Each structure stands twice: as structure tokens, then as C-alpha cells.
């Protein structure tokens, strides 16, 4: 489980390094939308929720917004693209603290390919 690392300014902006053999722990609180933003030029193919009805998915290019629309919304999201496949573990938080407003990925595989 990748648990994303918060920024130094605000704890609502979190950073995680993409690893193809690991999943990302997303803590979604009630009534906020989480901005998940993919790599530049990455073409989204398909996704799949554990519950299509627990979470709301909106995408515009490489910008993905999710939002819990039901109680006890514990599922997983697997959004697959041309380059890689992202696996998230959406676990709803019960006290509406410690939200995540934006998740941003650091890809070391593309940096290694550049190296």
C-alpha cells in the first residue's frame, strides 16, 4: 500500500511515486472531490470500480475527479491507460478530517527510461 506523502504547505495535497506492483491508499472523506491527475499525454482506456454507485467519477482528458456518493464506500478503482494501470484503494473516512484534495504521481520509470 502506497500511502501518499503530504506537501509541506498543506496536508491536503499529496504525492506518491508510481510503482506498478503496489496500490495507492486514497482516504476519501465525505463531500470533497479528489483530483487525480495522470501523466501528460497518457491516454485513458478504461476504469473499474468496486462500486459504481459508491463513488462518482468524472474525467476530462487526464484529469480525474472522484467523490463518495454513498455510506461506507470502501472499494477499489483500477484506471488503465495506454502506458500503465493505476490501482487505488478508496477507503472512506468517517470523521471528515484529513481530506485529500489532490493526488499527484511521481513516475520513476519514465525518468529511468530517460536515463
Amino acid at each position: 500500500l502506497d500511502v501518499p506523502s503530504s506537501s509541506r504547505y498543506d496536508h491536503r495535497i499529496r504525492y506518491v511515486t508510481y510503482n506498478p506492483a503496489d496500490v495507492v491508499q486514497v482516504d476519501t472523506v465525505l463531500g470533497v472531490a479528489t483530483h487525480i491527475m495522470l501523466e501528460e499525454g497518457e491516454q485513458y482506456l478504461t476504469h473499474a470500480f468496486g462500486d459504481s454507485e459508491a463513488y462518482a467519477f468524472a474525467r476530462k482528458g487526464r484529469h480525474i475527479f472522484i467523490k463518495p456518493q454513498a455510506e461506507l464506500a470502501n472499494t477499489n478503482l483500477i484506471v488503465v491507460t495506454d502506458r500503465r494501470s493505476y490501482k487505488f484503494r478508496l477507503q472512506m473516512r468517517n470523521d471528515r478530517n484529513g481530506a485529500m484534495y489532490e493526488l499527484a504521481f511521481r513516475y520513476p520509470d519514465t525518468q529511468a527510461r530517460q536515463t
Binding site: 470500480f49 459504481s52 454507485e53 461506507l72
Partner: peptide
Amino acid sequence: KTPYELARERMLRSGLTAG
């Protein structure tokens, strides 16, 4: 119909992708 039971039924009913 406890909330856990309602969640379980919702998990059963829902499809993979909505719409």
C-alpha cells in the same frame, strides 16, 4: 435493514462502470 446490510446489497447490485 442495518446500514451494513444496505451497503452489502449496494455492492452486489452495482456494475463495474456506471453508465
